[model samples]
Target: GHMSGEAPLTATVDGIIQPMLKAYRIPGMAVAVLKDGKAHYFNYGVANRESGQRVSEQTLFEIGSVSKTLTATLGAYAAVKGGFELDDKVSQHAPWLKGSAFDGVTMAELATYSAGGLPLQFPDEVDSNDKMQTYYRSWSPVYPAGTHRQFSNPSIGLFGHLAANSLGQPFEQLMSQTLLPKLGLHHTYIQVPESAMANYAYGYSKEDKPIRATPGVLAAEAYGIKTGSADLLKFVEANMGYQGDAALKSAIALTHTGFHSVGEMTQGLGWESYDYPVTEQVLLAGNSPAVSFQANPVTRFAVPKAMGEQRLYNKTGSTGGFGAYVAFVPARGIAIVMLANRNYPIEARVKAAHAILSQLAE
Candidate 1:
């Protein structure tokens, strides 16, 4: 299939990317679009205002809770691989949890954020020195299993720890050996490899301080991942079936399905169920409709009214003065990744992405 160039259409796509950097007060952005099985990209702007390094396609940046998707994905793989069942009691997986009330919680509730009344973060005193211990010990379920859903990293990360223990492997190794390499995700990692830094992007805080999210913090276990827009697009295409790689197909069933519902949001294993208003309209770049998200449906002021009822999936991330978004349409085999070094509001990221989607989807 020989395709002819469409200049006017390409200009429209370029126009959509820049406005978002300005609108969100971001300095630079790395974008990747997966159309068919290949990756097309837009790499522009600065990686750090202080360092004056250009933000290139291969640069790495931290992605916040977006890490949960991977954590949950690994968890799901563990379940399918026969390490344990999702409904088994937590105590069953990590018998050391016997004394804590969390022992009664099942892996299901932990993955879905539905173990009623799980606190979002460890208490300050407990979190001061070793948050993981404080978290595992103090995490007593406030309600019976399968009650209200409350999402938090401490909870998900705790489950991730338990999951790895069950499989006799550290979660990080699971990500690197089992998941990352399987999908050909070289840039995505929990503790970044020192070797990847030649093109890594340093983040600028909202206050204009230059800082990074990984290496110093345990972002890898939760969200510290630096991936190029190009790599992201490959992930998207893998999910979309353009590649249909065996590893990716399994990944999508885990990534795209609803794992829990909390506060009007139906959370897939890692992605959010939107039923939101602005979803479908943003497909110019890559859009995941949340219509499958039945809870509140993002009718908020920030959502674009043009969003349709079709279902899609997405995860949003922000850390160390950077913001990022990943969205994909599994049925359509379309996906996208947008990364910016300048920290900005969540709405701005979504808006900017939709601007790109407007061009691609139509």
Candidate 2:
């Protein structure tokens, strides 16, 4: 019920979002758009349906796996800050993986979801850190590393875990104490502090029950970030090369460098990218469930492409009760962040985002 922007901009966003909220029965949502370096925000419905708390710029929505992008950034930052190389063997930091299939896996492969077809989630029984270690020690590769792109939380989760291991700290601590501050994000959290609990939005399930994510084996390293759109858009701006910290800037750039191509989608560290002037169909295909749930063969780039090319970079994140999407074109100075308490379909998220960006870019 709150918004800030020019009339046409607000009109454009409202026209798309209001209908989306109605159709999905989403209790609350927040959206932020960045154009020509300026930011616009739109908030709707309620943060808590029972209590009647309204969505606001300060309300934190579960960003789910968009947190992986931050995890990747920390991985890259660890590399930049002299913690390790992207090509370093995982066993170097994780001695438990020394004799496993991971011995053949590189940090880069894990970060990019090419670590021999790890699954989308850890098996339900592997619920603790010790079990996770046991799982990896006996794990076998479904394909050779770097030969296929299989989007997996365990892949990137290990990437972040090793990043922290190399730095001699926990993932949450390093992310919260070091990387986030360096990127100037004050409203994002791996572990939302007690003081900020009131600002945290409760996600809604399909049955309209209120819920929030609970930490699991690799949750902090994978799908655990809760953030407001304003902070998330600030991160979007940082990805667009607007940042004050030099090393952090370079680390962010590294995550955007193209490593492999699966169809029209290029897999970067935690982000997926496509050439500029991309189509809605391509975006939809790249973000589709087939791509997320199944392993696809990839064409490895002989030489990785440098960052800042004209490309549309994006990532989608979700939990059982929430959905979020982020997209930006550095060349066009345009970006959008959508966060909702209800976990809607990814196809709908992609379509809505593409429509909004298409209008703004024109």
Candidate 3:
């Protein structure tokens, strides 16, 4: 139960989580903290408020946009396999964009959300393939490529889509069959299997209506992941360089290498990295909507460190009902994963996680 001179960790984690659930009014959630080569898991509240089912490590919740990190990993895998390069233009893989503004966009730009002015969401009318094609055909850049990070599902969505197509496999299939299994993540899925559906926790919308993410264009690329904290923490372990699989280790490392800068935050493939001893103020600033909503210009080609004294890498995700956040320090070999059935505020998620991490840093 004890790794070193440190007091037990599960006690600290348990102390923080129940109060956190109360303060956030989360109906149910799961958390996993990994350190000292061991993982401690905690489940709070209900998996379903209706049935009063308890959430265990296996209870699955939609991880929302955090799935982007996986998409980015798939991109890196494609590159390592010599399937596609980040510098290649989008049109090179998806020939349908040969003559459009997207032609000027490179894979890295899209993967990093720096493709210059793609909206955070496609218009309601851009639902079907015909509409999506028409939209991109007429699409224009608000800023030049690599100009800034405007967080958009369409950006990484297209990146994953093209990467999967380049590898000649469906995106979901590629992730479930190849990428995820290689990382030893059996319970994560773009579409939860029927067997796992029984354990699937339903998330609530703002109006308290039961809801889940529906499939749309770029569904696989953008935010279609449903996973348990157990599986996600294992993925986090891979990011922390504890996993033994060499190719997956390389792919996970690629996702942490920052390629662009949006203010104080450095954008990696899908994750964001920060300098060690990063403050709560800095973390909040980086995840703030102000940073993402504006046409923030970016500085390109910032150096990324493979290992460092205090580097932190993380991603936040949400669906209509669920809220999720993940963070890890590679140097310290510490990682945190949180998932909830209701959409909790990202600030609250960050604050709670930062508090727990601070204790571990002690």
Candidate 4:
């Protein structure tokens, strides 16, 4: 294991992380903590079980749904750059969606997972771009638009897709060539280049078999980001308003604005948030299986609440063989990013992050 930062900080992180790796049987884990505007990293276990490759700041792990936050940023950037409005109908940019269940849905609704009960994943039958369009064209909403949050990849995926359409660029090009670099994230990638393959971690499935993400329809827009702890921590810092690009700063701020409430959780563009001083019980309830796997009613705000420093914004992400969690408190100037090769429980991730942030924020 290798750790960075002062002895006391490393000791505090080590006390919590070592046991977690053992308990979860995780082959490799990387964590980064940001406090007082400084970032610290800790690495453990092995990136490759067979090769005995150590995890490092350079090791890239699939971040899964955390990528949605970046997608959300792109959508917000489109709006900031005058490409479109967040309230614009999906049909306006996606001609295929016109006259379908998605016709009446707005971009903001899609970004917030409130686009009329879209499922958590695309149906197995929807495996290609043409099939995806057909699915959306014939599909029916389970609920009225803006009335519920369903936490669907297809929901935010369309948001990103439509954002790119409005900007007259492909999603991957806009993400890789424009949005990512604008945010100062050079190491993060929607597609990892061959040159970077050596640094990419091999995720381990429950059977201890090596696995990596496979391409699917909208995978890039939904859960396809591969990055390391340092770049991810920098994103968290950007969300907290640390950046050089003024328009991008505004775009990031827009992603944090609260548009709807689902119990204690507030639905932002891609992030979910809670009022500061929130309890672990609330965090668990908000991130529970029910929240991720099922639809819940939401109360739309008459006026979207602007970003506040007193709020805690967070997101959790996972692929079949990887798990990640990111949370930050702008007021406290603290954030944490945890990435593991093994896809573990969300409850454990939330608890571990809450525990760490609680101590560091003190």
| Model 4 stretches with alpha carbons more than 4 Å out | 1-5
Give the clashing residue pairs of candidate 2, or none: none
Off by over 4 Å in 1: 1-9, 36-38, 127-131, 214-218, 242-248, 262-264, 275-310
Regarding TM-score, does 1 or 4 come out ahead?
4
lDDT string, candidate 2, 129-173, tens digits: 899999988998999899999888888998999898888998999
Candidate 3: tens digits of C-alpha lDDT, residues 251-342: 77788777877767888888887887789989988988887666688777744444442688888999999999999997787789999999
Kindly list the per-residue Cα lDDT of model 1 for residues 59-78, writing each as its tens digit: 77666767777777777677
Report RMSD (Å) for each prediction in the order shown: 6.2, 2.6, 2.3, 2.6
Worst 10 residues of 1 by lDDT: 295-304
TM-score of every model versus the real structure: 0.82, 0.97, 0.95, 0.96
Q: Residue 21, candidate 2: how far off, in angstroms?
A: 0.6
lDDT of 1 at 254: 57
Q: Which stretches of candidate 2 lie over 4 Å from their true place?
A: 1-5
User: Where's the lowest-lDDT run of ten residues in candidate 2?
Assistant: 1-10
Ranking by lDDT: 2, 4, 3, 1
Q: Candidate 4: deviation at residue 198, Å? A: 0.3
Candidate 3: segments with Cα more than 4 A from true spot = 1-8, 302-309
> For model 2, what is the C-alpha lDDT against the true structure?
0.89
Model 1 scores a C-alpha lDDT of 0.64
Superposed on all Cα atoms, model 3 deviates from the true structure by an RMSD in Å of: 2.3
